[PDB]
Amino acid sequence: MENFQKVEKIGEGTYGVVYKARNKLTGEVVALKKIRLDREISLLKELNHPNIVKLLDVIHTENKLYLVFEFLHQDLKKFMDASALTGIPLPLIKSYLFQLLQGLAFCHSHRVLHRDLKPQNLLINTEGAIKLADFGLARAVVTLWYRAPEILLGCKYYSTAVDIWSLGCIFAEMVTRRALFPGDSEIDQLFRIFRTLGTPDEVVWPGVTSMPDYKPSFPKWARQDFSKVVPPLDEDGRSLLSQMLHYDPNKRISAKAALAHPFFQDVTKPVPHL
Numbered sequence: 001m002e003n004f005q006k007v008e009k010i011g012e013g014t015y016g017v018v019y020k021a022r023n024k025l026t027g028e029v030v031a032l033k034k035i036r037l038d039r040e041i042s043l044l045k046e047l048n049h050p051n052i053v054k055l056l057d058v059i060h061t062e063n064k065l066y067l068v069f070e071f072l073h074q075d076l077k078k079f080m081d082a083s084a085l086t087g088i089p090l091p092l093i094k095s096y097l098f099q100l101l102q103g104l105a106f107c108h109s110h111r112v113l114h115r116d117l118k119p120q121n122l123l124i125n126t127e128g129a130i131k132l133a134d135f136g137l138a139r140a141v142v143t144l145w146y147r148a149p150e151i152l153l154g155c156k157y158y159s160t161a162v163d164i165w166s167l168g169c170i171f172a173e174m175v176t177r178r179a180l181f182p183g184d185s186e187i188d189q190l191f192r193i194f195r196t197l198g199t200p201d202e203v204v205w206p207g208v209t210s211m212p213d214y215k216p217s218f219p220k221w222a223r224q225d226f227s228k229v230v231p232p233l234d235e236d237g238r239s240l241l242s243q244m245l246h247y248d249p250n251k252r253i254s255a256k257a258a259l260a261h262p263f264f265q266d267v268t269k270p271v272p273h274l
């Protein structure tokens with residue numbers, strides 16, 4: 001790839017390095033990820049949604065694997081950090097949640113899960129958009145904070161519902177300026193979820209006790225009242241958030257259904273100052 005003049009390293013990680021890069025031909029500026037190694041992906045090139053960072057190209061050359069993405073300058077994590085003094089305005093929080101739910105409705109409608117939503121993976125632009133990025137497509141230190149309980153319990157087959165869970169945790173964090181469930185281990189992550197939402201049993205979650213890593217000796221914590229979870233979210237927002245953090249993947253609200261939730265009756269598209 002002498003076809004790309006590399007502007008700056010956007011990131012590393014076990015699965016590859018990404019650069020902001022200039023196409024010496026196009027003049028176009030892209031993010032370029034080189035996966036170090038040792039067609040299904042290309043179908044996604046034609047699946048484009050305003051709220052998903054676009055996959056432009058997949059290149060298998062000199063026995064290397066490169067993915068090319070649309071480039072955006074800021075992610076939600078940096079934006080929340082610079083907003084920590086003030087917080088993100090609720091109409092902008094509402095707008096970002098609405099847009100993320102649209103992105104997720106789109107990918108889920110095509111049976112594509114994200115599986116690792118986090119503020120670092122959510123890109124925003126000056127025109128008020130927010131886009132899903134980093135779908136871990138390379139799989140045919142990392143935060144557990146947004147991980148759905150079925151994954152933490154070793155479930156081999158998870159559903160679209162894992163993304164709803166992740167986005168709820170992100171919703172809550174946008175509102176409170178605090179990570180909802182800052183576990184420092186898998187079992188610490190689980191037990192932080194339990195201590196707030198109550199230890200799940202078959203009553204609220206049939207088949208929880210059949211998950212691979214479920215132990216009957218999990219401590220039994222009572223559910224806390226949601227009022228402490230996301231103050232000062234109003235009742236519509238708490239209602240919505242409660243349905244996104246449902247223990248049972250089959251009762252957790254879908255992306256499509258959340259879009260019809262009353263919380264969004266007054267949704268607008270504010271513009272951030274970046």
Ligand SMILES: COC(=O)[C@@H](Cc1ccc(O)cc1)NC(=O)c1cc(C(=O)O)c2cc(/C=C/c3ccc(Cl)cc3)ccc2n1
Pocket residue numbers: 010011018031033044047048052053054055067069070071072073075106107110112120121122123132133134135136137138
């Ligand atoms: C923020 O820092 C990061 O980690 C950024 C680096 C960065 C990238 C672009 C930028 O503009 C800015 C920064 N991301 C990645 O490395 C990264 C990795 C992957 C992957 O799978 O390996 C991505 C997959 C898609 C799928 C798209 C797709 C999915 C489903 C459908 Cl239906 C249609 C399309 C979209 C963006 C992706 N990004």
